[PDB]
Design an enzyme around this catalytic site. Structure first.
Site, short mmCIF file in Angstrom:
data_model
loop_
_atom_site.label_atom_id
_atom_site.label_comp_id
_atom_site.label_asym_id
_atom_site.label_seq_id
_atom_site.Cartn_x
_atom_site.Cartn_y
_atom_site.Cartn_z
N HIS A 60 0.69 -1.25 0.23
CA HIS A 60 0.08 0.11 -0.04
C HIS A 60 0.75 1.41 -0.04
CE1 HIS A 60 -2.19 -2.84 2.83
NE2 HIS A 60 -2.74 -3.08 1.82
N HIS A 77 1.26 4.60 2.08
CA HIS A 77 0.85 5.35 3.25
C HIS A 77 0.74 6.78 3.15
CE1 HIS A 77 0.48 1.91 6.22
NE2 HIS A 77 0.56 1.32 4.93
N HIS A 79 -3.06 4.39 5.38
CA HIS A 79 -3.16 4.51 4.00
C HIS A 79 -3.44 5.81 3.46
CE1 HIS A 79 -3.62 -0.43 4.00
NE2 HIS A 79 -2.67 -0.10 4.63
N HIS A 115 -11.30 0.67 3.75
CA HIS A 115 -10.03 -0.12 3.19
C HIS A 115 -10.85 -1.27 2.07
CE1 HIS A 115 -6.26 -2.15 2.45
NE2 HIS A 115 -6.96 -3.19 2.93
N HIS A 128 -9.13 2.48 0.05
CA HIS A 128 -8.31 3.73 0.02
C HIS A 128 -7.51 4.22 -1.18
CE1 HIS A 128 -8.36 2.29 4.52
NE2 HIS A 128 -9.25 3.35 4.43
N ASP A 160 -4.76 1.86 -1.71
CA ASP A 160 -4.93 0.36 -1.61
C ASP A 160 -4.50 -0.22 -2.95
OD1 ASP A 160 -6.08 0.63 0.85
OD2 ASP A 160 -7.76 0.38 0.70
N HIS A 179 3.84 -5.38 3.56
CA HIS A 179 3.40 -5.60 4.95
C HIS A 179 3.89 -7.25 5.02
CE1 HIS A 179 0.78 -2.35 6.37
NE2 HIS A 179 0.94 -1.98 5.08
N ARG A 201 5.13 -3.62 9.20
CA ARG A 201 5.45 -2.93 8.00
C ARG A 201 6.88 -3.37 7.73
NH1 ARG A 201 2.55 2.96 8.67
NH2 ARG A 201 0.70 2.13 9.78
CO LIG Z 1 -6.25 0.70 2.84
CU LIG Z 2 -0.61 -0.68 4.38
#
Ligand SMILES: [Co+2]
Ligand SMILES: [Cu+2]
Ligand SMILES: [Co+2]
Ligand SMILES: [Cu+2]
Lengths: 151, 151
Positions: free
Chosen positions: A44, A46, A61, A69, A78, A81, A118, A141
């Site tokens: 993702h 951020h 995000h 999400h 998001h 995403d 992730h 993360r």
């Molecule tokens: Co998200």
């Molecule tokens: Cu993320």
């Protein structure tokens, strides 16, 4: 801003380089990540390009449209995403993503933001917990980096 | 973007965190750098936020107006020309600058670009050699980082 690059680094073996290229009304995301455990990992964008505290400072995000999400193909997602990247048995993931939501310029611009990979896979907010509707249950993360302007 | 941040790192003892804030119509640059050799060090905004090859990949100085290298107070300078930071005995440099050329939005935006701290003092374009008109003879890049959007 038609090309960007991101160098992913963290506190473990996870490393990578992601390339961003604007094509039409889409951004094409390419590259590779290494030192990943086999399987899927949430990938993702951020909100913040803040590294002061490692990957933790990147915030949540990127979500300008104030939505929940979701997966890349979902309407309720998001902007940050991007769903999942999949590492092979040797822990390498090839990134090949096309996305109409992210951009390299204006309002939905990702330049100066952070890319994160992730620990667990992203459920696309279908987990059933609350968490799924926020984070996709992607966990930790592993690595991150600021998205910058490239030649 | 009205607030930005940069975490400087390299293959040395040198590191630091620099912040950018839009105050009125200008940009205030604050922060600190450590592990520096006592004296002056060139402090410039390099054009690319490309960290794939360390600070090397950051390219030349951000120079949208195609001018020659100069001091921060010169007419003739690169947008990225922030002059020098000075290191105390204990190798600490405190940053405190206001610049009329850099921006956090628009054509002059430094977001997504690379802040670099050099090994030597910046000539300010007054060295007398070609190199002067390029980088001020500031020399190698000890640490750098891509400027990201901050909270
Ligand atoms: Co998200
Ligand atoms: Cu993320
Ligand atoms: Co210059
Ligand atoms: Cu320089």
């Amino acid at each position: 801003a038609t090309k960007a690059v991101c160098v992913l680094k963290g506190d473990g073996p996870v490393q990578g380089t992601i390339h961003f290229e604007a094509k039409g009304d889409t951004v094409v995301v390419t590259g590779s990540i290494t030192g990943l455990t086999e399987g899927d990992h949430g990938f993702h964008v951020h909100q913040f390009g803040d590294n002061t505290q490692g990957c933790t400072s990147a915030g949540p995000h990127f979500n300008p449209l104030s939505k929940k999400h979701g997966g890349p193909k979902d309407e309720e997602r998001h902007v940050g995403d991007l769903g999942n990247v999949t590492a092979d048995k040797n822990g390498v993931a090839i990134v090949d993503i096309v996305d109409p939501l992210i951009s390299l310029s204006g309002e939905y611009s990702i330049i100066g933001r952070t890319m994160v990979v992730h620990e667990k896979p992203d459920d696309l907010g279908r987990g059933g917990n609350e968490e799924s509707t926020k984070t996709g249950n992607a966990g930790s993360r592993l690595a991150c980096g600021v998205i910058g302007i490239a030649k």
